[PDB]
Assembly symmetry: C2
């Protein structure tokens, strides 16, 4: 069976399971079950399934070099699909909540969930809670007797928690640290002293790389019982590197990709986000460029946003990006090589993850 149709089939199975359970054990009525079915479909489906499919691809890699009964191959691939859906639903939780937090309009060319007319924020905040709760229900049901259950649940929590901490680093990225204070409304930075590579890297490492790259890779290893085929520090290092690159591309596209192609009107400039473009621009600007950037950044006014875009275009940030891209190619290839000392197969899965990231 091809991997993607397996993966999509298991979505239907897990949906049925969750909704059947709500009816037998949580007293749900058919109309609220329908509401939850629609919510799940709307929030979990229509992406590329990169994260969840990575769990399946890692597991397929190991299957090709490990002796197993056919039933065992099937069980492992079914666990990989379940595990992939936990990651997709964890993503779904964060997109629902982040779109409410950020007052976002669209996502993927469709309205954010909370903006649907029969949803509203009141329900959507709790729908997003449910999305994440479903990841646990899946796990406890499908993995109750599995030897990797403990390790999988402990990994998943950590990644969830890293993610939430990353969200805090992101939403507070335009504030001056020494001014954080629940009692006092937070001004935007005026010096941009915290728009540094190291501070950027911290935001991205926690907000994206743990759930997007580390967790799919390591879930593949756990459902395969293959964590001893790898040096976990190397898996972490490569995940964080690749994940950083992924976000740098997202940052660049928020600004320069046509909204119809983006799926989204990009607002990083108005939102005063600590983007790769802002940081890299500040890393090369002269005094006058820095002052013009300060006078225009983090303002809804379209005349000012267009000044920030003009500054970025004039500053030749494509040069810095190809330099960055070169260095990431270097380091990711070094790490892949180090990953072959213990697992050629695993290193090859990492290669494929890198290729899918480095092209899109």
């Amino acid at each position: 069976m091809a991997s993607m149709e397996r993966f999509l089939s298991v979505y239907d199975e897990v949906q049925a399971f969750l909704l059947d359970q709500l009816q037998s054990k949580y007293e749900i009525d058919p109309n609220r079950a329908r509401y939850l079915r629609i919510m799940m479909d709307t929030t979990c489906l229509g992406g590329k399934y990169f994260r969840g499919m990575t769990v399946v691809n890692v597991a397929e890699g190991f299957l090709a070099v490990t002796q197993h009964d056919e039933a065992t191959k099937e069980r492992i691939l079914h666990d990989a699909c379940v595990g992939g859906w936990m990651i997709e639903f964890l993503q779904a939780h964060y997109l629902v909540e982040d779109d409410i937090m950020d007052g976002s309009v669209m996502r993927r060319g469709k309205p954010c969930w909370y903006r649907f007319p029969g949803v509203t924020t009141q329900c959507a905040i709790n729908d997003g809670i449910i999305l994440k709760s479903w990841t646990q229900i899946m796990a406890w049901h499908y993995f109750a007797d599995r030897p990797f259950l403990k390790d999988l649940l402990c990994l998943f929590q950590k990644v969830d928690y890293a993610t939430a901490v990353g969200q805090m680093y992101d939403v507070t990225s335009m504030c001056d640290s020494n001014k954080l204070d629940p009692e006092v409304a937070q001004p935007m930075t005026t010096d941009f002293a915290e728009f540094t590579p190291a501070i950027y890297k911290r935001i991205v490492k926690y907000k994206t790389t743990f759930y997007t790259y580390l967790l799919p890779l390591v879930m593949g290893l756990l459902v395969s019982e293959a964590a001893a085929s790898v040096e976990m520090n190397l898996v972490e290092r490569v995940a964080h590197l690749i994940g950083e690159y992924f976000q740098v591309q997202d940052d660049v596209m928020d600004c320069f990709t046509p909204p119809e192609q983006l799926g989204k009107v990009g607002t990083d400039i108005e939102d005063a986000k600590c983007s790769w473009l802002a940081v890299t621009f500040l890393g090369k600007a002269n005094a006058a460029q820095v002052a013009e950037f300060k006078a225009n950044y983090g303002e809804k006014d379209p005349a000012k946003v267009a000044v920030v875009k003009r500054l970025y275009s004039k500053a030749n940030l494509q040069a810095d990006f190809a330099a960055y891209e070169a260095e990431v190619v270097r380091e990711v290839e070094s790490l892949i090589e180090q990953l072959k000392v213990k697992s050629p197969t695993f290193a090859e899965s990492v290669a494929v993850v890198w290729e899918k990231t480095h092209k899109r």
Copy 2:
């Protein structure tokens, strides 16, 4: 050592642990650690700690009848305190999110977290995420080698999930079920056909009773390794009964308790909530009373809210409440008795839970 000072001491310990961990493993800076410290204190502290202290009281009960080394008594009480804080932090997560969902103003005579000037909804939604994530971090750290870890984490998830499903039942309680639909803005019910005792009971069972009563009782049993001293169906039945009673009192107080004493301006009438008062009023009203109630319920207009209050006062709902209260006294005493077949101690803890509920 007295139970409450133990419990409060363990709060400080767990706080220190969480913030120290953020610094050593999650790259946090001191100012964001301070923000999280303040958030934790503001959201987790200043209640009565009923839920978390119930875990400690159940555990104390078992200690008084079970032979153990002093070090083991200390370990059990420390686990009970940790477990109690997981419940308090789970509550904190739901109050933060529910206050944002409901557009609430105050809670306990202080502003809702999201309304603090340096917080805002953008941060508060994610602060509430973190609150719940901290419950898992506590568990994995303090209970990593404990034999009850699996059972505790599986119970906790279920209770979390019941809670979220209860929140969905509550936020959708004024809608007609057959009209739920993400695509279509939801009208308030005009017939109130779903304002029934059974429908009310379902809302309350899931939204409150699992986290408020079931989880503290069963956590006490798990940290005591005492789940075999009870018939779990009886613990569930008693939890749900007592929990229902608790919410009926909250419902009555939302309407009739002075806001300065309530901690809150009560808005259940304006919010068109399926409250015990609404249901019980509809269960006894004549046609004219039902029509006046329909013309006035679920409106912000203070003239209409005062009409709904007048209808409730005229309808002598105190009578129905003392009748309800009588029946709950009957059934809770029956269940306590059934709980003595297997554990006098456990039954006595349930008695104390009932006494603290039935007086406040």
